[PDB]
Design a protein around this ligand. Structure first.
Ligand SMILES: [Rb+]
Ligand SMILES: [Rb+]
Lengths: 412, 409
C-alpha cells in the first residue's frame, strides 16, 4: 500500500493569517468571534461571527482578478500559497515543476461556496434585470472554482476534485485526495477546505433553522463546545490547506514530513437531514473504521464539537463507545470556541490544528468551559492548553445530511 | 482488483420521466428544449431551456418537504427510486436490507444545487428582512442526505461539485470507494435544476448560452457549424454500483462492468477550455489505459459551444490517433440540453443502455458540417451497432475533467 505523508500546511482564520500565528492564538485560548462588520447585522437575531478583519486579497491576486473570485476562494488562495511554499515543491517561479505537474492534483472542499455572490447577483437580477448579473458571477461562486483558481496558480494538472458535504467537506477533501494517491491517480495532492458565508442569507438561513447561538452580548463567550450552557454554533470563515505526498517522493527529495496519513472512516447516519443520530451511531462507525485502519494509539482527538446541544452530546457518547469507556477516550478538544464553526473549511483547518498540536506537543483547549454538563463528561482540555506528547491525532467532522468523515494522522 | 458492476439505473430529464421513455426519445432524436415557463423569462436574452414540464414532486415528497428540498433533490429522489427499484435490492418497505445497509453508500453530484432556493431567500431577506426555503434545501450534499434516509443506506456519503463534470466524478469517487473496500455497493446520482433568473442570467452574462430563442428545438447542436452556446437543461441520472461477488451472491442483474476512469485538470483558464483539449486528452488517455478495452462508442461532452466542441474533437483525434480511428461519437445534449452537474450521470446511463440495446443515439441538429469538427458524430439518426465498451466525457468549468469507461457484462 502506498504511504502518504504531509509535507506542507497553511491556514487563515479569525485568529491569524498564517498557521503559526493562528495556532499560537488557538492554543492560548484566544477567540476570534466578534460582532459582525462585513454586513449590517444590527436587525438580525444573530449578530456575531468569526470574521477575519485583516485579510487583504490583493496580496494573493491582482486587483482585477479579485472580483472574479468569491471570498472563500481568495482565502483558499492564501492558505494554499502558504502550504505550497511550505512543501518546497514550487520552482523558481512559485509553480510546480512542469515535469511533475501531471502527477499533482487538488482536492477542494466547501459547504456553500460563494453564497454572498449568489445573494448579490440574485438581487441585481431581481431588481435591475439579468444583464446586471456580473459576468464573473459564476466563476466567483461555484465551489470547485477553488480547484480552478488554485490549479492555475500552481500549475498542477492532476485530478481536480471537490467535496461539498457541508460541515464535513474539509475532511472529505482530505480523504478523497488520500484515495486518489492510494490508487496511483497522483503522487501529490493539494488539499484545501475554504468557507466564507458571513452574509445576510447565510446568517439568516442558519438562524432560521435554529442552529446558531444568539448570545450576542459577549461574542467571545458564545461558542462553548460541550459546556452546559451551549446554545448553537457560531459561523466562522477561513481556509486550511495541506500538501499530501507519496512517501518515497517525499523522502527522496528530502522534504520535511509533518505527519503520515494513518486512517480514515466515512459513513452516513441515514436518520435526519439536520439533527445528528441518537447515540452518534454514524459518527461511531466512521470513528471505528478510521481507528481500525490506522492501528495506532490516538493521543488527541480534535472533536467536531460545534457547541450545539445535540451534536456535542451525541459526539461524546460516540467517543465513549468507540474507545470502550470514558477513561479510554484520549484528551479531546473542539477548537470551534476559538475560531468558530467554519463549515466546509472546518475539517481542513482542524487537520492542520491537530497535526501542529502533535508536532509541538501542545494540545489546544476547549474554551468557555464554565459549567460542566453531566452528560458531556469527557476530558475536553478545559480553557488552557495541555503540554503532552502524542504519536497520533484524530479529527472528526459530522455534517448536515448525516454525513460523517474522520481522519487519523500519525507521527512521522 | 475488486470488480464493479452496474446493477440498476434510472433517469429523468426533459424527454422522459424514466430511463425507458427518455432513452427511446433520445435515440429517436427528439428534443426536450422548450421556451422557458418555470419563471418569467420574457425580458431575458436567453429564453429557452430543457425544462421538465411533467414532473410531479408529490410522488417523491410530502408538501412539508418542499421547503426542505430544492427541485434538484426532488429529481434525484425520482431517479434514485427508479434505480434502486431496478436493482432489486429493496425489501418490502422499499429500503435496503438492514444487514447490507452499513456497506452501501451514496455518491451525489451537482454543480450548483438549489440555486433558485438561495435566490428566493436572498430576495426575500432583501425585501422583508431577516423565509421561503430552508438553507438546507439548497446544499448539494442534501441529495445524499435525503436519498440515504430514503433507502436507509449508511455507508460512505460523498458529494462531488466539479461543475459540468460532477456527475462523472460522482461515479468515479464511488468507484474508488468500492475499490478500496470502503463499501460493497454505492448509489450514484447526478442531479441539477438551475433554470431560474440568476442561473440563466449568470451563464448568459459569461456568454455561454445559445440565444437562438426563436427555435428551441434547433438551438442545441453539438459540433455543428452554427452552434452558438449551450442550452441549460435539468434532470437527474442514477446508477447502482456493486462489487462483483456481492452482486452475483444476491443474483443481481448486470448492465455493464466498470472498466476505467481518468481525471485531470487543465490548469489553464477558469472558463475557457484548454487549447487542443490538452487536459481532456490526458483524462481520456488514462481511462483508456486503465480499461484495456476497445471502445465502440463515445458519449462526448459536446455542449454545443464553439471552443468545447472544437477542443474535444481535437483531443479525441489525438487520443485515438486520427479522424478514422476515433470510435463513433455522439453528444446527447442536443436532445436534453446541458444538464451541468447531472450531465455525467445522465450520460453514463445513456451510454450503458446504448451498449445494452446496440443503438447508438445521434447528435441532432447536424445541418452544416464544421470542417474543424470533422469526426463521425452519428448525425441526426441513431446507428444500429453492437459495442463492447463505451466512454463518457465530462469537461467542466474550472478546467476539471472526468472520463469513465464501461464494458459489456
Ligand atoms: Rb475536527
Ligand atoms: Rb458524456
Amino acid at each position: 500500500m502506498r504511504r502518504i505523508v504531509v509535507t506542507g500546511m497553511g491556514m487563515i482564520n479569525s485568529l491569524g493569517l498564517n498557521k503559526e500565528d493562528s495556532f499560537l492564538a488557538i492554543a492560548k485560548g484566544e477567540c476570534g468571534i466578534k460582532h459582525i462588520e462585513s454586513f449590517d447585522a444590527s436587525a438580525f437575531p444573530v449578530r456575531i461571527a468569526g470574521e477575519i478583519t485583516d485579510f487583504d486579497p490583493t496580496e494573493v491576486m491582482n486587483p482585477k482578478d479579485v472580483k472574479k473570485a468569491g471570498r472563500f476562494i481568495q482565502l483558499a488562495l492564501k492558505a494554499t500559497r502558504e502550504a505550497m511554499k511550505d512543501s518546497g515543491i514550487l520552482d523558481a517561479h512559485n509553480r510546480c515543476p512542469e515535469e511533475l505537474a501531471n502527477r499533482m492534483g487538488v482536492s477542494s472542499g466547501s459547504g456553500i461556496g460563494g453564497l454572498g455572490n449568489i445573494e448579490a447577483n440574485s438581487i441585481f437580477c431581481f431588481e435591475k434585470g439579468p444583464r446586471k448579473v456580473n459576468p464573473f458571477f459564476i466563476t466567483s461562486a461555484l465551489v470547485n472554482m477553488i480547484g480552478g483558481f488554485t490549479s492555475i496558480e500552481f500549475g498542477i494538472k492532476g485530478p481536480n476534485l471537490s467535496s461539498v458535504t457541508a460541515c464535513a467537506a474539509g475532511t472529505h477533501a482530505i480523504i478523497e485526495a488520500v484515495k486518489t494517491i492510494l490508487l496511483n491517480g497522483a503522487d501529490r495532492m493539494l488539499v484545501v477546505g475554504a468557507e466564507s458565508t458571513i452574509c445576510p442569507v447565510g446568517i439568516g438561513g442558519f438562524a432560521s433553522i435554529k442552529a446558531l447561538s444568539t448570545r450576542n452580548d459577549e461574542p467571545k463567550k458564545a461558542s462553548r463546545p460541550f459546556d452546559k450552557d451551549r446554545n448553537g454554533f457560531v459561523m466562522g470563515e477561513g481556509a486550511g490547506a495541506l500538501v499530501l505526498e507519496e512517501y518515497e517522493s517525499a523522502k527522496k527529495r528530502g522534504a520535511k514530513i509533518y505527519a503520515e496519513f494513518a486512517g480514515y472512516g466515512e459513513s452516513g447516519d441515514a436518520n435526519h437531514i439536520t439533527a445528528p443520530a441518537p447515540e452518534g451511531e454514524g459518527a461511531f462507525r466512521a470513528m471505528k473504521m478510521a481507528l481500525e485502519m490506522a492501528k495506532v494509539e490516538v493521543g488527541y482527538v480534535n472533536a467536531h464539537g460545534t457547541s450545539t446541544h445535540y451534536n456535542d452530546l451525541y459526539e461524546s457518547i460516540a467517543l465513549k463507545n468507540v474507545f470502550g469507556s470514558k477513561e479510554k477516550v484520549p484528551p479531546v478538544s473542539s477548537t470551534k470556541g476559538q475560531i468558530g464553526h467554519c463549515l466546509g473549511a472546518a475539517g481542513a483547518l482542524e487537520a492542520v490544528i491537530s497535526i501542529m498540536a502533535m508536532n509541538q506537543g501542545i494540545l489546544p483547549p476547549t474554551i468557555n468551559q464554565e459549567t460542566p454538563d453531566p452528560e458531556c463528561d469527557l476530558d475536553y482540555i478545559p480553557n488552557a492548553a495541555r503540554e503532552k506528547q502524542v504519536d497520533a491525532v484524530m479529527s472528526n467532522s459530522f455534517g448536515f445530511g448525516g454525513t460523517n468523515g474522520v481522519v487519523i494522522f500519525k507521527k512521522a
